[PDB]
Amino acid sequence: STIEEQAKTFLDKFNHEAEDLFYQSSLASWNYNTNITEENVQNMNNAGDKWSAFLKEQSTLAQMYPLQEIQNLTVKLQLQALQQNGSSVLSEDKSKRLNTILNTMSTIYSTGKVCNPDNPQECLLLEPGLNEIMANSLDYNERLWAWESWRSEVGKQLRPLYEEYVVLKNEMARANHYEDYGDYWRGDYEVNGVDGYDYSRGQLIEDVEHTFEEIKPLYEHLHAYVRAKLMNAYPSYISPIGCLPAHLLGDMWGRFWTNLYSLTVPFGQKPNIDVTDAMVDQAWDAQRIFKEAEKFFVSVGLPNMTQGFWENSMLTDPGNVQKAVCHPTAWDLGKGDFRILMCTKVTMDDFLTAHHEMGHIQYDMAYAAQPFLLRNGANEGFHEAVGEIMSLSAATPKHLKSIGLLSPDFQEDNETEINFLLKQALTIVGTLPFTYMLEKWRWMVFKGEIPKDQWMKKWWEMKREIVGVVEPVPHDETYCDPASLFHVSNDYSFIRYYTRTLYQFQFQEALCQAAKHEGPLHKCDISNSTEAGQKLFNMLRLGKSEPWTLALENVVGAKNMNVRPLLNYFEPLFTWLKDQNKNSFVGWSTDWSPYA
Amino acid sequence: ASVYAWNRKRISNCVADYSVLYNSASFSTFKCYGVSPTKLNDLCFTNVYADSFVIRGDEVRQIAPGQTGKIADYNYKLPDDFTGCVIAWNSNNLDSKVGGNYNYRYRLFRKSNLKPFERDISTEIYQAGSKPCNGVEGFNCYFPLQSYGFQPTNGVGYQPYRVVVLSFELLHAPATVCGPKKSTNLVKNKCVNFNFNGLTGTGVLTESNKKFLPFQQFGRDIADTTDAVRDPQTLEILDITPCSFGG
Numbered sequence: 112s113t114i115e116e117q118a119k120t121f122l123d124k125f126n127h128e129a130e131d132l133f134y135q136s137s138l139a140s141w142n143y144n145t146n147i148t149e150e151n152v153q154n155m156n157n158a159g160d161k162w163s164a165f166l167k168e169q170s171t172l173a174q175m176y177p178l179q180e181i182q183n184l185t186v187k188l189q190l191q192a193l194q195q196n197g198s199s200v201l202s203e204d205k206s207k208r209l210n211t212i213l214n215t216m217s218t219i220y221s222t223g224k225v226c227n228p229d230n231p232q233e234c235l236l237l238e239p240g241l242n243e244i245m246a247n248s249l250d251y252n253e254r255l256w257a258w259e260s261w262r263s264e265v266g267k268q269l270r271p272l273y274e275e276y277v278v279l280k281n282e283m284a285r286a287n288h289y290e291d292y293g294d295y296w297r298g299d300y301e302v303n304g305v306d307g308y309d310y311s312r313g314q315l316i317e318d319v320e321h322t323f324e325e326i327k328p329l330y331e332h333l334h335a336y337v338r339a340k341l342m343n344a345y346p347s348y349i350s351p352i353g354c355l356p357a358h359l360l361g362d363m364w365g366r367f368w369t370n371l372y373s374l375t376v377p378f379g380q381k382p383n384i385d386v387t388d389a390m391v392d393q394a395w396d397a398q399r400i401f402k403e404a405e406k407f408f409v410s411v412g413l414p415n416m417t418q419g420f421w422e423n424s425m426l427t428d429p430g431n432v433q434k435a436v437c438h439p440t441a442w443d444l445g446k447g448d449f450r451i452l453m454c455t456k457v458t459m460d461d462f463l464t465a466h467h468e469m470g471h472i473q474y475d476m477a478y479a480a481q482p483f484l485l486r487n488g489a490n491e492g493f494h495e496a497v498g499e500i501m502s503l504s505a506a507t508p509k510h511l512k513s514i515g516l517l518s519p520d521f522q523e524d525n526e527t528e529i530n531f532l533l534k535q536a537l538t539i540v541g542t543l544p545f546t547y548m549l550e551k552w553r554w555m556v557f558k559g560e561i562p563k564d565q566w567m568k569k570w571w572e573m574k575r576e577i578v579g580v581v582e583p584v585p586h587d588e589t590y591c592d593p594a595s596l597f598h599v600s601n602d603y604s605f606i607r608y609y610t611r612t613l614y615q616f617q618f619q620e621a622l623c624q625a626a627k628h629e630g631p632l633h634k635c636d637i638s639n640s641t642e643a644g645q646k647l648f649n650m651l652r653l654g655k656s657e658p659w660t661l662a663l664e665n666v667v668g669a670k671n672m673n674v675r676p677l678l679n680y681f682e683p684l685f686t687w688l689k690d691q692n693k694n695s696f697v698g699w700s701t702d703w704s705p706y707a
Numbered sequence: 708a709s710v711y712a713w714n715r716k717r718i719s720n721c722v723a724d725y726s727v728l729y730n731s732a733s734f735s736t737f738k739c740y741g742v743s744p745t746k747l748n749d750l751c752f753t754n755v756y757a758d759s760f761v762i763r764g765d766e767v768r769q770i771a772p773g774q775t776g777k778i779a780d781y782n783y784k785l786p787d788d789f790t791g792c793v794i795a796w797n798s799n800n801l802d803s804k805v806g807g808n809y810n811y812r813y814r815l816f817r818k819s820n821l822k823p824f825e826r827d828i829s830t831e832i833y834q835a836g837s838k839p840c841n842g843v844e845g846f847n848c849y850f851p852l853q854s855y856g857f858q859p860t861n862g863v864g865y866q867p868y869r870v871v872v873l874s875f876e877l878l879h880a881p882a883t884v885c886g887p888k889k890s891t892n893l894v895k896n897k898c899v900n901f902n903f904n905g906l907t908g909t910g911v912l913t914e915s916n917k918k919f920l921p922f923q924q925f926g927r928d929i930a931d932t933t934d935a936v937r938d939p940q941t942l943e944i945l946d947i948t949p950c951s952f953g954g
């Protein structure tokens with residue numbers, strides 16, 4: 112017989128025995144995150160190598176197949192996951208050095224130590240405290256000192272470590288037949304199959320900024336408004352020609368502007384939409400919130416969840432020594448096992464988080480029918496975008512009034528609409544330029560375009576044009592400032608976050624059009640509209656079995672990624688900012704600095 | 708026993724109550740193909756064959772006439788002309804084990820599809836490429852039989868389902884199994900009709916003093932006209948008189 116039948120039989124033998132091991136490993140992980148105990152720890156080891164002792168061995172049985180002639184797209188794509196060289200192509204010394212440098216970089220980043228000079232006996236970490244201090248404060252000196260100290264104890268000594276990590280990852284990139292690690296990172300948004308849908312990895316690079324130029328004027332108006340509010344609060348710290356520094360953004364990275372929302376509130380006279388006091392008055396516990404959110408999911412069009420989830424899955428208050436880390440997670444343990452992990456409480460934020468996690472669960476339901484190697488979405492951003500869709504949709508007053516969360520006689524006006532829209536934009540569009548520049552900097556440092564010396568100064572000068580940040584203190588060559596970030600020390604692709612917002616906005620806009628809703632986009636709700644849920648689930652069921660370009664064809668009519676929904680959402684905000692900061696001129700200068 | 712070693716049972720020379728099987732909530736799926744389940748108690752065949760085994764939850768649909776699949780082709784086969792019923796029910800509470808009930812095994816590789824009412828228990832290694840598998844498993848060598856990792860928490864799709872397929876054969880041999888009879892009570896001194904042990908007729912039934920020998924069932928006087936019958940339950944001699952008529 113032909114080799115294709117042999118490959119099919121190999122896959123049919125592989126998936127059946129892989130399902131049991133994957134289920135056992137995921138069950139152990141879920142139990143440990145639900146039962147923090149010593150015994151569940153070694154099990155991971157007892158599973159980990161074991162899983163490798165299976166998977167790599169199956170990978171060992173996935174090279175002799177000439178994976179270039181299998182006509183069936185699904186079988187060839189499934190076998191392609193098993194036909195990955197990985198780090199095994201590297202030498203043993205190189206692999207162990209990579210493991211050691213990754214471990215030490217992660218430990219150093221996660222063990223930040225900043226002691227104030229007056230009391231050198233007490234440092235602070237990324238744990239609550241200094242994080243909270245810089246997240247919520249009104250000052251220029253303490254924030255700047257904290258930023259400088261963190262960049263000194265995480266970026267000063269990480270220059271050789273980051274250099275070696277980048278060069279060794281890139282050596283592995285060539286070892287995996289890739290001239291750059293950026294190609295391997297962008298391979299998630301890649302397909303070379305069906306005609307009319309094939310996407311090149313290098314095309315995503317230009318698509319990132321081709322969808323970014325349209326939000327540049329709106330970002331400039333938002334920057335001008337924030338600068339004006341800073342001048343209102345901070346006296347003579349930011350010149351009108353210049354721009355605000357990094358430490359005044361509410362974080363040492365300036366990732367999100369939500370921390371600075373209090374200073375730049377549009378209208379504090381009208382309170383925000385919050386029914387948590389009504390949630391307590393209505394006596395909505397974790398069970399009631401979960402049931403109401405599941406009912407909303409069903410009314411949208413997503414199927415009711417299978418039995419057994421309500422018992423195994425932890426919901427609230429681990430309590431005693433039977434502890435459980437409850438970071439919001441949705442577990443797809445395999446073999447039809449879907450569970451939630453969260454400290455669900457009586458809170459609107461917890462309400463939205465529960466909606467997000469059960470949206471993740473519903474998407475896990477969507478591609479459950481796919482084989483083990485295809486038990487994933489078209490791209491990693493689709494999962495997060497889908498999880499965020501209904502969480503964003505449920506915040507509208509219509510859904511709250513449908514189940515009587517807001518008052519039955521609640522009336523909205525333009526003031527609170529503008530306030531909410533600006534608050535949402537301070538987190539949604541206020542992070543796109545930073546993610547864009549960070550991803551481009553990672554791409555160019557992996558490509559080796561910039562020499563060894565020209566790393567930090569180029570980053571700081573380009574942040575002025577892209578983000579709009581000046582340097583309160585200098586960092587030329589003795590600092591590695593982006594290295595003090597979560598997704599720098601664990602080899603994390605950062606394009607997923609950039610694509611997730613655009614994907615979720617496109618899906619929300621498409622559902623708003625095909626959901627019989629009228630008015631502003633921010634008030635759009637998809638509750639009790641089964642057609643929108645069916646349209647969503649049609650694309651959800653695709654999973655990894657279909658390309659991402661083909662996946663972006665059911666909900667939306669355009670395969671390519673576009674920016675129009677982003678500007679459509681913040682239309683009232685754009686109109687308000689057109690006439691709000693008229694006196695303050697738009698734009699910033701990259702020559703002005705706090706020091707000179 | 709496992710699906711590839713399905714238990715075969717032969718039932719003959721007895722009376723079958725299909726109503727109680729129909730009136731049982733313990734069976735999740737009950738699909739008949741010969742006749743309606745209620746009518747099954749009326750008609751009958753000469754023998755019954757039961758094929759009982761345990762499978763996955765998702766493989767119950769495979770056990771059907773004109774159906775294809777791993778179980779439907781490699782472990783058991785049902786012909787298009789199948790007469791009878793199929794009764795399946797979840798057994799996760801019993802068959803599934805906390806440590807894994809790996810005893811249950813199902814066939815995954817075989818050169819030919821199994822014939823109807825045929826069993827395969829071959830454990831010989833299967834070859835899918837060109838190189839023969841000379842004993843020890845190599846490149847193109849995968850075991851035809853795969854075990855079941857049944858656990859109490861496996862989702863409805865994978866739960867162990869017990870399936871019994873009942874077929875009815877009515878060969879030229881005399882029938883041996885039939886349904887119930889549900890005889891009524893007895894009345895006297897009234898013009899009624901009757902079907903005593905399959906002997907039908909009208910008239911009035913009175914008490915008689917005739918002495919049947921211990922083996923007759925009914926007696927007629929002359930010209931082939933039945934007069935006395937023996938009730939199959941009480942075993943006593945009755946008397947039949949035609950209902951009165953005249954001008």
Ligand SMILES: *[C@@H]1O[C@H](CO)[C@@H](O[C@@H]2O[C@H](CO)[C@@H](O)[C@H](O)[C@H]2NC(C)=O)[C@H](O)[C@H]1NC(C)=O
Pocket residue numbers: 939940941942
């Ligand atoms: C059919 O079954 C009934 C019930 O067992 C039998 O009726 C019994 O007959 C004996 C004989 O005199 C009595 O002593 C019992 O009291 C009866 N039981 C009852 C009425 O419940 C009947 O004889 C059986 N028919 C046979 C054996 O031909």
